[PDB]
C-alpha cells in the first residue's frame, strides 16, 4: 500500500466522504469506534513513515491528513496521543500544498489540508491557516481565526496543559475557568 | 430616505465579515446594538416593509430580524420574537429573486430564518435552499433539520420558552 495508487488510500477517502460533515464536525463515539476499527493500522503505518509515497497523489495526500490529523482526535481522546503526529501532519500538509493537492480535491474536502496549521502551537502556522481558509470563507474562516486568537494570546492551547503536564499560567487559568 | 440606513446595515455586516458573524464578542454585540437597535424596532413595527423592493435592503431586513436578536437579545425569549416576521420577509424576498441577486457569501442570510423556524416544513426548505451552497452552511442546515424532524422543535429552547422537556428531549439534551 506504499504508493499513491494504494487501495488503502482510496478506502480511507471513500470512508470519509461516506461519513460526511455529519461525522467530521460533531462528536460521536460510534464514529470514533468505526474509524478506529477500519484504520488504526493505517494510522501507525503513516506514523512509521511507510506511506510517504502517498504525497504523490492529491486524494492519497488527503488520506495522510485524515490519518495524521483527524484520526488521533477521534481515536486517542483525552491523551497525549491526540497530538503525537501533529508535527508530521503539518510537514505533510506543507508538502501537499506545495504540490497543489489542496486545490485538486473538492472544496468540501480542502479544509483537511489546512487543519494541521490550525492545530499547531505556533504563530506562523496559525497565520498560514487563516490565509488558506480565507477563500473557503464563512465558518471555515471563523474556525481558523478562533484558533489563531488563542495561540497569539498564549503561544499554545491552554486546554492541552493537563494532558501535556504543562504549568498553567494565571491568565490561562482565568481563560479556562471562564469557558 | 431609509435607503441609506439599509445600505449602512449591509456595509456594517459585510465589513465585519465571517470573523465576527459567528463569534461571541460582547463588544461587537454592543456595537451592533447601539448602532441598529432603532432600526430593529422600526422593522419589527412594520415601518420598513418597503425594503422588500430591493435586494440589499431585503438583506438588511434579514440582518435586523434574524441576526440582530441573536447578537443583541442573547439568552432571552426576545431572540425569537421576530423570527416569524423574518421568515415571512425571507419567503417574499426569495419570491422576488433577491437571494439569487446577491453573492453566495451573503446569500445564506436569506436562508437562516428557515433553519431558525421550529417547523419541519421550514427545515426541509432550509436544506433545499442551502443545497447549492454546500459546505458548512448546508451541514448546519441539515443538523438543524435533524433536530426538528425528530422533535417538532429545538430542545435547547425549552428553558427560554418554559417548556417541559420530554424524556426523549431530556436525554437528547444531556448527550452533547
Ligand atoms: Ca508513481
Ligand atoms: Ca472572531
Ligand atoms: Ca459553498
Ligand atoms: Cl485552548
Ligand atoms: Cl460554507
Ligand atoms: Cl436543540
**Resolution in A for the shown PDB structure?**
1.8
Contact A13, A59 (CB under 8 A): yes
Give the CATH fold of the B81-176 domain.
1.25.40
* Residue A103 CB neighbour total at 10 angstroms: 12
Residues B26, B80, B147, CA angle at the centre, nearest 5°? 100
Which residues fall within 8 angstroms of residue A31, CB to CB, at 6 or more apart? Answer: A19, A23, A74
- CATH 3.40.50.300 corresponds to the domain A2-83: no
Contact A76, A82 (CB under 8 A): yes
Backbone angles phi, psi at B160, to 5 degrees: -65, -40
Distance CA A31, CA A43 (A): 16
Contact B110, B121 (CB under 8 A): no
Q: A138 at the B interface (CB within 8 A)?
A: yes
Q: Per-domain residue ranges for chain A?
A: 2-83, 84-179
For residue B49, what is the DSSP state? G
Transcribe chain A into DSSP letters.
--STT-HHHHHHHHHHHHH-HHHHSS--HHHHHHHHHHHHHHHHHHHTTS-GGGGGSHHHHHHHHIIIIIHHHHHSTTSGGGTTTHHHHHHHHHHHHHTTHHHHS-HHHHGGGTHHHHTSSSHHHHHHHHHHHTTT-HHHHHHHHHHHHHHHHHSS-GGGHHHHTPPPPHHHHHHHHT-
Structure determination technique employed: X-ray
CATH of domain B1-80: 1.20.58.320
Chain B nearest CA to A24, separation (Å):
10
Instruction: Using DSSP, state whether B131 is helix, strand or coil.
Output: coil
| Of the partner residues B23, B137, B142, the one whose CB lies closest to the CB of residue A138 | B137
Instruction: Using DSSP, state whether B17 is helix, strand or coil.
Output: coil
What is the biggest distance separating any 2 CA atoms in chain A, rounded to whole angstroms? 51
Distance CA A174, CA B136 (A): 31
Give the CATH fold of the A84-179 domain.
1.25.40
Burial category of A161 from C-beta neighbours within 10 Å (exposed 0-12, middle 13-18, buried 19 and up) = middle
| CA atoms in the 13 A half-sphere facing the CB of A78 | 0
Q: Which helix (H) or strand (E) holds B93?
A: helix B83-95
Chain A nearest CA to B133, separation (Å):
11
Contact A26 B176 (CB under 8 A): yes
Q: A98 at the B interface (CB within 8 A)?
A: no
Distance CA A22, CA A59 (A): 20
Chain B nearest CA to A83, separation (Å):
23
Distance CA B88, CA B58 (A): 12
For A127, A157, B3, B64, the CA distances from B20, given in Å and listed in that order, are: 17, 21, 24, 16
Output the nine-digit C-alpha cell for A9. 488510500
| Of the partner residues B19, B134, B176, the one whose CB lies closest to the CB of residue A141 | B19
Amino acid at each position: 500500500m506504499k504508493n499513491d495508487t494504494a487501495a488503502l488510500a482510496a478506502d480511507i477517502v471513500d470512508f470519509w466522504k461516506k461519513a460526511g460533515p455529519d461525522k467530521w464536525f460533531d462528536k460521536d463515539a460510534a464514529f470514533d469506534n468505526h474509524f478506529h476499527d477500519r484504520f488504526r493500522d493505517a494510522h501507525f503505518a503513516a506514523a512509521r513513515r511507510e506511506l510517504d509515497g502517498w504525497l504523490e497523489g492529491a486524494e492519497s495526500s488527503l488520506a495522510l491528513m485524515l490519518l495524521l490529523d483527524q484520526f488521533p482526535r477521534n481515536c486517542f481522546r483525552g491523551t497525549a496521543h491526540m497530538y503525537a503526529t501533529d508535527p508530521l501532519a503539518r510537514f505533510f500538509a506543507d508538502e501537499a500544498i506545495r504540490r497543489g493537492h489542496d486545490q485538486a480535491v473538492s472544496e468540501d474536502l480542502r479544509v483537511f489540508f489546512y487543519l494541521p496549521f490550525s492545530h499547531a502551537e505556533d504563530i506562523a502556522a496559525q497565520q498560514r491557516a487563516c490565509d488558506l481558509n480565507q477563500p473557503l470563507g464563512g465558518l471555515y474562516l471563523h474556525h481558523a481565526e478562533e484558533h489563531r486568537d488563542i495561540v497569539e494570546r498564549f503561544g499554545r492551547f491552554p486546554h492541552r496543559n493537563g494532558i501535556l503536564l504543562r504549568e498553567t499560567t494565571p491568565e490561562e487559568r482565568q481563560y479556562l475557568e471562564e469557558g
